[PDB]
Short mmCIF file of C-alpha atoms and ligand atoms in Angstrom, two decimals:
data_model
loop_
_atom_site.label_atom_id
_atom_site.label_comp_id
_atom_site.label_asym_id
_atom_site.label_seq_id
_atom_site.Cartn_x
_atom_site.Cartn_y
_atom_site.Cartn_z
CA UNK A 1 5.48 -28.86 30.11
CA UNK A 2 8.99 -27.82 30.15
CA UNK A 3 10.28 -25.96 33.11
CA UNK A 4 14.06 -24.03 33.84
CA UNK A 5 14.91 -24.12 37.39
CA UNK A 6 18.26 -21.50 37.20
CA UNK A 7 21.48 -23.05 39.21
CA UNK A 8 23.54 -21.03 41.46
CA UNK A 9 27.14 -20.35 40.65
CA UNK A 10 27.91 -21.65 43.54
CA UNK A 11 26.22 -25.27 43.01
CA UNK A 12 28.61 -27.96 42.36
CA UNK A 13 26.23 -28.38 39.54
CA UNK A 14 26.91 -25.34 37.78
CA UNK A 15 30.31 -25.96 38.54
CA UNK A 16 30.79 -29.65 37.11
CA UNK A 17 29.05 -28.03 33.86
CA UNK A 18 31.36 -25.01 33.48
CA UNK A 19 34.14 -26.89 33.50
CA UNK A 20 33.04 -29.51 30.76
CA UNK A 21 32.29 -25.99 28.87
CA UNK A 22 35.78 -24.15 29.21
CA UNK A 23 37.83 -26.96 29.35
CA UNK A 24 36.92 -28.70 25.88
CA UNK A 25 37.25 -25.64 23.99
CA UNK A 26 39.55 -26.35 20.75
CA UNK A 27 41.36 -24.41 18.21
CA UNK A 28 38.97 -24.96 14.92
CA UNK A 29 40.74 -25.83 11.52
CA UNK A 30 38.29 -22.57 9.99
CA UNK A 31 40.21 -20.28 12.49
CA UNK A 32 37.56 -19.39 13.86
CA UNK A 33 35.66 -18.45 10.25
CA UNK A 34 32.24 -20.50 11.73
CA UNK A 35 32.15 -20.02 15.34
CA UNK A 36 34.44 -17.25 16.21
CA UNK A 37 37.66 -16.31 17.49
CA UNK A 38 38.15 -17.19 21.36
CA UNK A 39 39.96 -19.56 24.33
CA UNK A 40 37.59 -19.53 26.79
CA UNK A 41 33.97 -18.77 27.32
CA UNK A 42 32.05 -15.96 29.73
CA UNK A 43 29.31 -18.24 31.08
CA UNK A 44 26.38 -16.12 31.75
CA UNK A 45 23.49 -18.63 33.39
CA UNK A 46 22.97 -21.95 33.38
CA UNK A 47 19.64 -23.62 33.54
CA UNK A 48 18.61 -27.33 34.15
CA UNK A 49 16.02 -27.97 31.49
CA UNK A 50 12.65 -29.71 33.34
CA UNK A 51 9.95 -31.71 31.35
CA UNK A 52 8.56 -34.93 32.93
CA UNK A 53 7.25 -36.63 29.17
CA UNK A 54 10.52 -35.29 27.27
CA UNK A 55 12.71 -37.37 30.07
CA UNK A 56 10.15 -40.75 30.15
CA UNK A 57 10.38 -40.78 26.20
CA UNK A 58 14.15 -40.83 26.65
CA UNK A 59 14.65 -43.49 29.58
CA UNK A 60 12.00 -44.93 27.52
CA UNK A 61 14.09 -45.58 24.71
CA UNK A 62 17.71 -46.06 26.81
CA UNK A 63 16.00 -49.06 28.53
CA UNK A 64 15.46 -50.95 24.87
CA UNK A 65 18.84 -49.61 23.56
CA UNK A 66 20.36 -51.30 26.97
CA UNK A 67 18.51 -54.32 26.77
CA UNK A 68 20.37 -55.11 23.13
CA UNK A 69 23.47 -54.19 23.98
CA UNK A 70 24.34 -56.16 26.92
CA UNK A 71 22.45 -53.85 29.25
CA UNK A 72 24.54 -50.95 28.57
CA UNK A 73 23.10 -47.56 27.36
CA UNK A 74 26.61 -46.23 26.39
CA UNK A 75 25.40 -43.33 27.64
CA UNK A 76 27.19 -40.04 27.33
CA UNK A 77 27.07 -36.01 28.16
CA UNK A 78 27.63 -34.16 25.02
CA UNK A 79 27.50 -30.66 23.86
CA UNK A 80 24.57 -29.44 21.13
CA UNK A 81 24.28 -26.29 19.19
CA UNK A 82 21.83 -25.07 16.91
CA UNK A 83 19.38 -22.67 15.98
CA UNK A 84 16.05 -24.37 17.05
CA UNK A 85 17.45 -25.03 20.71
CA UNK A 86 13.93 -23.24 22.47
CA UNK A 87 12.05 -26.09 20.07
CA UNK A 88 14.56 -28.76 21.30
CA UNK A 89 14.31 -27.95 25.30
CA UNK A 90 9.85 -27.62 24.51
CA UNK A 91 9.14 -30.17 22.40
CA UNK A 92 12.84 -32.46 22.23
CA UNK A 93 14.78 -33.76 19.58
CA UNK A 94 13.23 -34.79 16.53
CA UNK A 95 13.68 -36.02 12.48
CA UNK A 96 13.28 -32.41 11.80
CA UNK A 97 16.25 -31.32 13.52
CA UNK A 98 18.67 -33.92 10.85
CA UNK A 99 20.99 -32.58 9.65
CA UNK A 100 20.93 -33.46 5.65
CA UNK A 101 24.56 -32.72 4.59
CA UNK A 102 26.44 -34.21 7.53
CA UNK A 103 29.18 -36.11 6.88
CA UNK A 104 27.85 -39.51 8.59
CA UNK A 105 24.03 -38.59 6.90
CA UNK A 106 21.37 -37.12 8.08
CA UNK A 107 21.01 -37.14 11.88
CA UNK A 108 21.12 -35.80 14.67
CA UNK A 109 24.75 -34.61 15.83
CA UNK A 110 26.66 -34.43 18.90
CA UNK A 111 30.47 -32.54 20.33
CA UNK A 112 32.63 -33.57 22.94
CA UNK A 113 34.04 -30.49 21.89
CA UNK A 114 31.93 -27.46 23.29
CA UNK A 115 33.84 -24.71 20.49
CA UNK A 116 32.91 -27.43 17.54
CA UNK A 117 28.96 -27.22 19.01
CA UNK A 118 29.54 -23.42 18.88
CA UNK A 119 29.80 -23.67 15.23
CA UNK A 120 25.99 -24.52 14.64
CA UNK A 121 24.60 -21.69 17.03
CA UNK A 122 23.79 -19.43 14.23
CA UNK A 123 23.54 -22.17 11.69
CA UNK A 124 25.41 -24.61 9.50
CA UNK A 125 28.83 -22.70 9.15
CA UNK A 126 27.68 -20.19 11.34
CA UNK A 127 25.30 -18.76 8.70
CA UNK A 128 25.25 -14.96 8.91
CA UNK A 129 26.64 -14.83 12.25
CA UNK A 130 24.46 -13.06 15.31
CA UNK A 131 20.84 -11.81 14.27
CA UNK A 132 21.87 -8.26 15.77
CA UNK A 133 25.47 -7.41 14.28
CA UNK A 134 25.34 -10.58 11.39
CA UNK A 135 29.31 -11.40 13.33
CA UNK A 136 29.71 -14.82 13.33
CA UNK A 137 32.69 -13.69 16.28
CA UNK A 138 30.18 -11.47 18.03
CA UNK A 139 31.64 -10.58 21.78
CA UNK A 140 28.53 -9.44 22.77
CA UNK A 141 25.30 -10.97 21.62
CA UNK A 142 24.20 -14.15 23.88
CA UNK A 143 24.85 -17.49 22.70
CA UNK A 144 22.77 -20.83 24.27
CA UNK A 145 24.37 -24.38 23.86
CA UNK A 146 22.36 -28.05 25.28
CA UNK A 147 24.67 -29.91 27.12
CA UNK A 148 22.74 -33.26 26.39
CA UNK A 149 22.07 -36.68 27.85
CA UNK A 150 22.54 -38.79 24.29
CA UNK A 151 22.28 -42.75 24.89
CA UNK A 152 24.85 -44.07 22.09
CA UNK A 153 24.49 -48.18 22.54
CA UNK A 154 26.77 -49.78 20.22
CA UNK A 155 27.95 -47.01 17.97
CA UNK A 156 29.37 -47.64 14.27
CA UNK A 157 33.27 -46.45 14.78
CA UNK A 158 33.89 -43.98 11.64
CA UNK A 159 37.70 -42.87 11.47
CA UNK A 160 37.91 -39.86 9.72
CA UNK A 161 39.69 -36.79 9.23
CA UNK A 162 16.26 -38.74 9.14
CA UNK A 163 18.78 -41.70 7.89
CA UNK A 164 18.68 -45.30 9.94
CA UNK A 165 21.54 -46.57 12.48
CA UNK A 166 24.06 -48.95 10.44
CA UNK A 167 22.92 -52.09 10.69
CA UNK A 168 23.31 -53.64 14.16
CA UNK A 169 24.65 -50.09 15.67
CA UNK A 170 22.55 -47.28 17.64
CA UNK A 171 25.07 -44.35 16.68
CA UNK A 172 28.01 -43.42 14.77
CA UNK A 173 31.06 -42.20 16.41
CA UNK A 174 32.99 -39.99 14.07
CA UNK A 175 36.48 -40.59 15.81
CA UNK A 176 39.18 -37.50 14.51
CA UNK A 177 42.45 -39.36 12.27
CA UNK A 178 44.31 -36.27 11.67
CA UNK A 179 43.95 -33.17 14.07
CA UNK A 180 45.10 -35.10 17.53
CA UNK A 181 43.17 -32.38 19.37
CA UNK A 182 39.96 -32.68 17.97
CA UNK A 183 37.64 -34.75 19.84
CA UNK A 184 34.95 -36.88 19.44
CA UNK A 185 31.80 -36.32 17.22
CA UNK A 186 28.73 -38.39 17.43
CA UNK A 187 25.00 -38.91 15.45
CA UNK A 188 22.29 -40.54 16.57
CA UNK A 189 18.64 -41.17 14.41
CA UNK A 190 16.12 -41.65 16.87
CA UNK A 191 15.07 -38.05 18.83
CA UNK A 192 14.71 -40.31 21.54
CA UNK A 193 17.77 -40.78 22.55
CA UNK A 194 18.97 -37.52 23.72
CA UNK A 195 17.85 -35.74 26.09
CA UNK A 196 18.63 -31.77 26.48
CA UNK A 197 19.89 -31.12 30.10
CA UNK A 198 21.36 -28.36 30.63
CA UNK A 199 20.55 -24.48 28.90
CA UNK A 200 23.87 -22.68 29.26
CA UNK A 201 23.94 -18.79 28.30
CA UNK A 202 27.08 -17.74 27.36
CA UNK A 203 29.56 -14.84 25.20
CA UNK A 204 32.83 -16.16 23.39
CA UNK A 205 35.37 -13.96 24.74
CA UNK A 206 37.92 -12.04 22.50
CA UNK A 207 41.47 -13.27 23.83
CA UNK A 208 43.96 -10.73 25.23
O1 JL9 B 1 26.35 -29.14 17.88
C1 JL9 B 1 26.25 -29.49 16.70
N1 JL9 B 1 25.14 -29.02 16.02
C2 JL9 B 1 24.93 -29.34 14.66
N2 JL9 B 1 23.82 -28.91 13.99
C3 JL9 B 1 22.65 -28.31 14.74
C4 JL9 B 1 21.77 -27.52 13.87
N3 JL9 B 1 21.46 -28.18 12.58
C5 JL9 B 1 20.57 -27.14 12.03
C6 JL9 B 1 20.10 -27.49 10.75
C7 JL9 B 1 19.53 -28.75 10.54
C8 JL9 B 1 19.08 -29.13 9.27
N4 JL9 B 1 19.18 -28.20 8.22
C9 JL9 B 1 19.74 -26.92 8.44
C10 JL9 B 1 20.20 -26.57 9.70
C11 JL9 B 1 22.78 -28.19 11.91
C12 JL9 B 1 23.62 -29.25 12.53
N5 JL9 B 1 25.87 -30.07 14.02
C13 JL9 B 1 26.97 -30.55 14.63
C14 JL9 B 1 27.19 -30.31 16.01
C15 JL9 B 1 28.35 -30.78 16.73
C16 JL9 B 1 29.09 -31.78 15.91
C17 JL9 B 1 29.26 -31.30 14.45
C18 JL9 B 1 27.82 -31.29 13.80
ZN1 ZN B 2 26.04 -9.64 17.90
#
C-alpha cells in the first residue's frame, strides 16, 4: 500500500527538507572512516512516502503515548539511515530493524544529525561501503536517508560522550557531553512510533 508522490524543487516542501539535510551535516570523530568525507550533500529527489495503515498504526500509537504524558507526543523530525530503508517505507519500522550493539540497547535509532544517519546507509560502520565500488566515501553511487516522524513522549535523558523503554519513559535521548557539535541521538522500542516521511536521494559531495 505504500505510494511516492515525487516533490518539486521548487515546493516549499522540498525546500524545508533540504535544508534540515545540508544544514545538520557535522564533522564525524571517524573522519569520515564510516560515512565518508564531505560538507554538504547533492540532493538528487525527494519523495513523500504514502501508506494509509503505516500512518494510522503510528497516530495510533502517538495518541496513547500523548495521553500518558500530559497530552504531549514529544514529537520530533529526525533523520534515519540504514540498509533495509525499501522494507521500512513498505512495511514500517519494526523489532527486526534493532539495532543489538547500540549503545542505549537494542532499538530503534534516530539523528538530528543527517551526516551521523549517513553512517548506517551501507551498514553498521558503513560496512563495505557502496555495493558497486565497496567506498564507504563513494561520490557517485546514490545514497537514500528517511527523514522520520518519531513520537518520543517522555524520553530517558542519557548524557554521554527489541529492548523495553526505561521504566516510566517512551525513548532515550542520548544527549552529546563532549563534542559540543554533535547533536542529538535518540531510540525508541516500539516500530510504532516512527513514521518514515520523507525518501531523500542523494550523493555526498567531495569538498573543493
Ligand atoms: O540513522 C541511524 N541508523 C542506525 N542504524 C540503522 C541500520 N541498523 C541496521 C542493522 C540493524 C541490526 N543489525 C545490523 C544492522 C543499524 C543501526 N543507527 C543509528 C542512526 C543514527 C543514530 C546513530 C545510530
Ligand atoms: Zn559507489
Amino acid at each position: 500500500g505504500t505510494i511516492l508522490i515525487d516533490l518539486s524543487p521548487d515546493d516549499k516542501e522540498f525546500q524545508s527538507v533540504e535544508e534540515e539535510m545540508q544544514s545538520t551535516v557535522r564533522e564525524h570523530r571517524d573522519g569520515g572512516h564510516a560515512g565518508g568525507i564531505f560538507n554538504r550533500y547533492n540532493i538528487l529527489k525527494i519523495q513523500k512516502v504514502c501508506n494509509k495503515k503505516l500512518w494510522e498504526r503510528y497516530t495510533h500509537r502517538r495518541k496513547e503515548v500523548s495521553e500518558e504524558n500530559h497530552n504531549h507526543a514529544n514529537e520530533r523530525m529526525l533523520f534515519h539511515g540504514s540498509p533495509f530503508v525499501n522494507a521500512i517505507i513498505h512495511k514500517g519500522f519494526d523489532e527486526r530493524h534493532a539495532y543489538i550493539g547500540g549503545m542505549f540497547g537494542a532499538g530503534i535509532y534516530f539523528a538530528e544529525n543527517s551526516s551521523k544517519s549517513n553512517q548506517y546507509v551501507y551498514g553498521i560502520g558503513g560496512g563495505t561501503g557502496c555495493p558497486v565500488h565497496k567506498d564507504r566515501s563513494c561520490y557517485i553511487c546514490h545514497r537514500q536517508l528517511l527523514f522520520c516522524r518519531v513520537t518520543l513522549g517522555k524520553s530517558f535523558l542519557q548524557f554521554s560522550a527489541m529492548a523495553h523503554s526505561p521504566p516510566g519513559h517512551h525513548s532515550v535521548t542520548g544527549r552529546p557531553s563532549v563534542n559540543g557539535l554533535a547533536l542529538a541521538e535518540y531510540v525508541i522500542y516500539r516500530g510504532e512510533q516512527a513514521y518514515p516521511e520523507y525518501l531523500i536521494t542523494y550523493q555526498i559531495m567531495r569538498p573543493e
